[PDB]
Design a protein around this motif. Structure first.
Motif, short mmCIF file in Angstrom:
data_model
loop_
_atom_site.label_atom_id
_atom_site.label_comp_id
_atom_site.label_asym_id
_atom_site.label_seq_id
_atom_site.Cartn_x
_atom_site.Cartn_y
_atom_site.Cartn_z
N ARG A 1 40.78 2.69 -10.05
CA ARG A 1 40.17 3.20 -9.34
C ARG A 1 41.62 3.61 -8.51
O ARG A 1 43.22 2.75 -8.49
N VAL B 1 29.63 -14.25 -5.31
CA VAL B 1 29.89 -13.16 -4.92
C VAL B 1 29.12 -12.89 -3.38
O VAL B 1 29.05 -12.30 -2.33
N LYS C 1 29.79 -15.37 -10.22
CA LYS C 1 30.99 -14.25 -10.95
C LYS C 1 30.15 -14.83 -12.36
O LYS C 1 30.04 -15.24 -13.28
N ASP D 1 44.21 -7.74 -2.12
CA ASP D 1 43.96 -8.15 -2.45
C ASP D 1 43.80 -7.24 -4.08
O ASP D 1 43.75 -7.93 -5.06
N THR D 2 43.41 -6.20 -3.66
CA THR D 2 42.36 -5.14 -4.58
C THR D 2 44.13 -4.48 -5.00
O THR D 2 44.15 -3.69 -6.44
N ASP E 1 36.72 -12.08 -0.81
CA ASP E 1 37.56 -12.34 -2.27
C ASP E 1 37.12 -11.22 -3.75
O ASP E 1 37.76 -10.03 -4.49
N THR E 2 35.82 -11.25 -3.28
CA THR E 2 35.11 -9.47 -4.76
C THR E 2 35.07 -8.17 -3.56
O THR E 2 35.12 -6.98 -4.77
N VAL E 3 35.35 -7.74 -2.26
CA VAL E 3 35.41 -6.71 -1.60
C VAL E 3 36.41 -6.16 -3.02
O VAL E 3 37.55 -6.30 -2.25
N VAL E 4 36.36 -4.81 -2.90
CA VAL E 4 37.34 -3.97 -2.63
C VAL E 4 37.69 -3.06 -1.85
O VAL E 4 38.88 -2.53 -1.51
N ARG F 1 32.02 -1.95 -1.76
CA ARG F 1 32.44 -1.51 -3.77
C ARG F 1 32.78 -3.00 -3.73
O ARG F 1 34.23 -4.15 -3.18
N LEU F 2 32.84 -3.69 -4.70
CA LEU F 2 33.01 -4.82 -5.02
C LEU F 2 33.69 -4.96 -6.64
O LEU F 2 33.61 -4.19 -7.40
N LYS F 3 33.89 -5.90 -6.76
CA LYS F 3 35.04 -6.40 -7.96
C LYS F 3 33.57 -5.76 -9.05
O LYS F 3 32.46 -6.71 -9.36
N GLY F 4 33.83 -5.31 -10.37
CA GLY F 4 33.55 -5.03 -11.35
C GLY F 4 32.23 -4.19 -11.47
O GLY F 4 30.89 -3.78 -11.99
N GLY F 5 32.40 -3.11 -10.58
CA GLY F 5 31.28 -2.09 -10.11
C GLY F 5 29.86 -2.26 -9.52
O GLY F 5 29.33 -0.87 -9.48
N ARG F 6 30.25 -3.12 -8.96
CA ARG F 6 28.38 -3.71 -7.95
C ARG F 6 29.65 -2.61 -6.93
O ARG F 6 30.12 -2.92 -5.90
N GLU F 7 27.72 -2.58 -6.22
CA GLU F 7 27.95 -2.11 -5.04
C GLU F 7 27.18 -1.95 -3.91
O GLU F 7 25.63 -3.17 -3.88
N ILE G 1 41.14 -0.77 2.69
CA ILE G 1 40.18 -1.32 1.33
C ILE G 1 41.61 -3.01 1.59
O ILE G 1 42.44 -3.50 1.95
N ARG G 2 41.05 -4.19 0.42
CA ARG G 2 41.31 -5.42 0.88
C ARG G 2 43.15 -4.97 -0.09
O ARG G 2 42.56 -5.05 -1.22
#
Lengths: 72, 72, 71, 72, 72, 72, 71
Positions: G23, E66, E20, G63-64, F64-67, F19-25, G60-61
């Protein structure tokens, strides 16, 4: 020690202000809650930096983003 | 010695609660749990150092608390 | 030796507590729990190396703590 | 092999513990637990090279820990 | 089937660990646990195409990770 | 109520978008996952700011990073 | 009428899903669990008021998620 959750319980069916993380805030009527402090508001408005951005008849809020809840 | 025991002898007494972000609350402590969620009565929300509101009751989520100190 | 045990050795002695964000507290360690919550008597909040607040006592949420060390 | 077992054989040995925010600690590893909370003795608090302070001991919260590495 | 199992497949083989903040660690995966903490040998910390640090071994907190992948 | 994880199971061995936190994919084939949504992708690719940045044969992604996760 | 009860009433119905980071997702609510993970069908990812993606299904997780609202 009075329990903090019992204060939400005593607030059921009444208008409340809910502060969330990030400058977001909700004003509505509290109609439910749980352990994680997830909330449900009826007839509510979402404020973003002192400005209204939306009105919804019902919203389920994740407790994770809640800063504080106080009856209006 | 336990920290919560300190919150206990602060019950029905004035305290200062600093939150993440810099937001502050000055009110009477009415309740708390192991997670340190708190309940304050007759409290003043203080942003940047200015009374931005006056609520007679507030439930605060533990995750947001940085510290709680008894009133001078 | 376990982390919580090193705390116990610091009771009744002055400590420095850094918090997330960068602020600090200098005071007498009077107590703590498993969560790393702490109690400081006669403490000062410190930002940028200067005192901003003096309190007779404070309870610091373990979650906001970065580190604790004897002064 | 287990990450915490590597920590075990590094007890009493010097290590570098990097924290979030670019902060580091240089000292002797004296203890740790499941969550990776650490105990360092005769440690140097480093910030961009210069020493902020030195401590006889320090308890570091696992949460702020990025990594740990020897430094013989 | 399970994520960790595919991580086991990499024991003693070089991997890439994205942290991160944007930094990376490239090294030999020598161990790991359920918290996803990692042990890397003869590794390099990378920041924007450049090797910013070398360590003979390092234990990374799962929390700051990550993703982990074998060499490209 | 249909369960998110079961829908996720119906996607095993099929191409997904993560989709991950911070625009990463990540775009790759779903090979595994757990209750916390830690994932395993085979024949995947990382994407930052709209551009490919790397291609991995396999990658383990911390939950925890996954959206979100969706079929390609 | 806790939270999860409200989500059940919305199965097969369209919802608004706000996520941390700006989002937003809009679609039919097909599933959820205690963790508040969500499954949406025929959904649009919205960012800055502009549709940036149309998906047949998305998980969708929890936590988000910031909040879920019947639309």
């Amino acid at each position: 020690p009075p329990r903090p959750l019992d204060v939400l319980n005593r607030s059921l069916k009444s208008p409340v202000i809910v502060r969330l993380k990030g400058g977001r805030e909700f004003r509505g009527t509290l109609d439910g809650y749980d352990i994680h402090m997830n909330l449900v508001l009826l007839d509510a408005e979402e404020i973003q930096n002192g400005e209204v951005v939306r009105k919804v008849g019902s919203v389920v809020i994740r407790g994770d983003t809640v800063v504080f809840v106080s009856p209006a």
